[PDB]
């Protein structure tokens, strides 16, 4: 009977990898990364002080023999174990979802880290509020909290997760359309590019200003790194009456707002989903009409660095998905007893005990998500 015993190394083992590369690589320390950590760390700690006693109860036919003065600690310990391990992944995927919405001050972790925590924290805190003691936390006693705890600890973030998750998809699609659009070689490109993006506008009313080219170039000189050469494109697509002139020119604007470190992050993220080839072409016209001798080097560096978003975005989803295949069951079962008029409550307890242990597996395969798709 080694099928469960073993199954705990993989995920200490996991876990502290984890802890270790992100902490002494540096190669490896983003934002979310950081939240990995506390993630990993997390999942170690269900590995020494949850999975070896819960299997060491099985010895026992569901009673305890140990100190009875650390039961209610160890309820309390499974508790916050699990409500951290699901709300550090709504925590990702929110400050993912904040991150691209307004970058603004994102571009120019451990308060969030201790916010979680403590969040966690106080979501646990009802559970230590002849015969024997058996930890089996029976739902007459605990039968307010089956229901709350419960609902604050997966349907509460799991609402969230979903949403916030699929809000950062959303703008890199917004932006991979408008781009591609962009790039299909009608002045219908900048009309979506404007809502993907978010001086956008301003290029509308190109294709004219009579008084607005005094901001227009005023915009062009707020990029120090495309320098004049922006200003340049704009003077000739001005002579030149649109046509090509003007698909030159929003193409170098937007090899150049991809430039700039304050777009950068969002321009790589949009640029993740997409063919990634017309958008490649796109961005190559637009570096050979900017002139800038370096700007194949920089225009593949882009491209590199919208790689980079894709990769973890997959990672993420993995993760994701499983949280939600392997959890849900339990937490769905766990209503279900609450509520019933004739349901037995044998049929519902056998399934509850398989169920419990199912979602205590998750912590396990994290680090084997990342380090399978390294
Ligand atoms: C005998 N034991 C089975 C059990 C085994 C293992 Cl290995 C872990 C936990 C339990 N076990 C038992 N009773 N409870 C639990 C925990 C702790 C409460 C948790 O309920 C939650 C969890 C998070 C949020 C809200 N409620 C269900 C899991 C009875």
Redesign the pocket.
């Known amino acids: 009977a080694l099928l469960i015993l073993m199954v705990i190394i993989p995920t200490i083992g996991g876990n502290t990898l984890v802890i270790l590369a992100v902490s002494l690589e540096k190669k490896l320390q983003y934002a979310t990364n950081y939240f990995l950590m506390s993630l990993a760390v997390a999942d170690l700690l269900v590995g020494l002080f949850?999975?070896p006693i819960?299997?060491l109860?099985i010895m026992f036919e569901?009673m305890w023999p140990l100190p009875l003065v650390l039961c209610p600690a160890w309820?309390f310990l499974?508790?916050l174990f699990?409500?951290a391990s699901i709300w550090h992944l709504c925590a990702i995927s929110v400050d993912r979802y904040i991150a691209i919405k307004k970058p603004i001050q994102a571009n120019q972790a451990f308060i969030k880290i201790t916010v979680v925590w403590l969040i966690s924290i106080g979501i646990?805190i009802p559970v230590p509020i002849p015969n024997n003691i058996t930890?089996?936390?029976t739902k007459e006693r605990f039968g307010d909290?089956?229901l709350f705890?419960?609902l604050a600890?997966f349907f509460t973030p799991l609402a969230i997760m979903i949403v916030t998750y699929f809000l950062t998809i959303r703008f890199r699609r917004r932006g991979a359309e408008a781009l591609e659009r962009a790039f299909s070689l009608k002045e219908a490109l900048l009309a979506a590019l404007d809502a993907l993006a978010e001086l956008l506008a301003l290029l509308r009313r190109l294709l004219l200003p009579a008084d607005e080219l005094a901001a227009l170039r005023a915009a062009l000189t707020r990029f120090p790194e495309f320098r004049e050469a922006l200003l340049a494109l704009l003077d000739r697509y001005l002579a030149t009456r649109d046509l090509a002139d003007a698909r030159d020119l929003v193409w170098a604007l937007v090899l150049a707002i991809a430039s700039d470190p304050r777009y950068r992050p969002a321009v790589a993220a949009m640029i993740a989903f997409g063919d990634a080839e017309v958008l490649r072409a796109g961005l190559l016209r637009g570096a050979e009409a900017l002139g800038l001798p370096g700007g194949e080097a920089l225009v593949e560096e882009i491209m590199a660095e919208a790689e980079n978003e894709q990769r973890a975005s997959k990672v993420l989803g993995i993760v994701f998905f499983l949280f939600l295949l392997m959890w849900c069951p339990f937490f769905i079962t766990?209503i279900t007893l609450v509520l019933c008029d004739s349901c037995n409550q044998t049929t519902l307890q056998m399934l509850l005990?398989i169920f419990?242990?199912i979602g205590?597996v998750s912590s396990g395969v994290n680090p084997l998500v990342y380090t399978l798709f390294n």
């Open positions: 949850v999975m819960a299997l109860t569901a309820l499974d508790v699990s409500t646990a930890c089996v936390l909290f089956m705890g419960s600890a766990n005990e419990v242990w205590y």
